[PDB]
C-alpha cells in the first residue's frame, strides 16, 4: 500500500476527503507500531527517499484553491504526533537546490497569507 | 537572412545520419500517451508578477543528474 504515492497524488489534486482518509489510515498504522520510532518512522513515511521532500514541499509546488484547508489539517496532523518542528523546519537535502525548506516556496508562490 | 540562406544548404549537402543533434529530443509532453515532440529551453525576465499555475517539473535548472 504505497501511501506516499497515494498522498503525493492526493495533494497534487487536493481532495481534502481523500487526504483525510490517507490521514486516518497512516495515523492508524502509526498506532500499531507504537515502539521507539514514533517520531522517526512517521517522518520517513513523509520523507522522500531521493529528495528529502515532504508532502508539504509537494503541497506548495501545486497551488490549488483548496490548499488553505489542506495545509491546516496537515499541520494538525503534524502537531498530533509532535513532529512539527522537525517537519516544518526540514530542508531540501538532495544537494542540488539544497537547504530549501518549503517556506522558501511560500514566498515564491506569492502566498504570504498562509505563509 | 543571408547567413540563414547559407546554413541550410550545408545541411542540404549533408546527407549523413545527422549526428549534429541540435535539440532536446523526444522530451515528453503533458499528454499521457504523447511522450514525443522534441523541444527547446529558453529564458524570460521580469514582467507580469503573479502565481504560476501550469508547470512541468519540480524546478531544477538543468535536467536532474
A88 close to B (CB below 8 A):
no
- How far apart CA A85 and CA A19 sit, in angstroms, is 22
b (16+ CB within 10 A) / e for B19-46: eeeeeeeeeeeeeeeeeeeeeeeeeeee
Residues of A in contact with B51 (CB under 8 A): 63, 109-111
Q: What is the largest CA-CA distance in chain B?
A: 48
- Residue of chain A with shortest Cα separation from B54: A62
Residues of B in contact with A112 (CB under 8 A): none
B65 close to A (CB below 8 A):
no
Helices marked H in chain B: 2-12
How was this one solved?
A: cryo-EM
- How far apart CA A26 and CA A6 sit, in angstroms, is 11
Burial of A19 (0-12, 13-18, 19+ CB in 10 A): buried
The resolution in angstroms reads 5.2
- How far apart CA A63 and CA B53 sit, in angstroms, is 7
Amino acid at each position: 500500500k504505497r501511501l506516499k504515492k497515494r498522498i503525493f497524488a492526493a495533494v497534487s489534486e487536493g481532495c481534502v476527503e481523500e487526504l483525510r482518509e490517507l490521514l486516518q489510515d497512516l495515523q492508524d498504522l502509526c498506532r500499531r507500531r507504537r515502539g521507539l520510532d514514533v517520531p522517526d518512522f512517521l517522518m520517513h513515511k513523509l520523507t522522500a527517499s531521493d529528495t528529502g521532500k515532504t508532502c508539504l514541499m509537494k503541497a506548495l509546488l501545486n497551488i490549488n484553491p483548496n490548499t488553505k484547508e489542506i495545509v491546516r489539517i496537515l499541520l494538525a496532523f503534524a502537531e498530533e504526533n509532535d513532529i512539527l518542528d522537525r517537519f516544518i523546519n526540514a530542508e531540501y537535502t538532495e544537494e542540488a537546490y539544497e537547504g530549501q525548506t518549503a517556506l522558501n516556496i511560500a514566498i515564491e508562490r506569492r502566498q504570504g497569507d498562509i505563509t | 537572412l543571408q547567413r540563414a540562406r547559407t546554413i541550410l544548404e550545408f545541411e542540404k549537402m549533408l546527407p549523413e545520419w545527422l549526428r549534429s543533434r541540435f535539440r532536446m529530443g523526444e522530451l515528453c509532453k503533458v499528454a499521457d500517451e504523447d511522450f514525443r515532440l522534441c523541444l527547446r529551453i529558453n529564458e524570460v525576465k521580469w514582467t507580469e508578477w503573479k502565481t504560476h499555475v501550469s508547470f512541468l517539473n519540480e524546478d531544477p535548472g538543468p535536467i536532474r543528474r
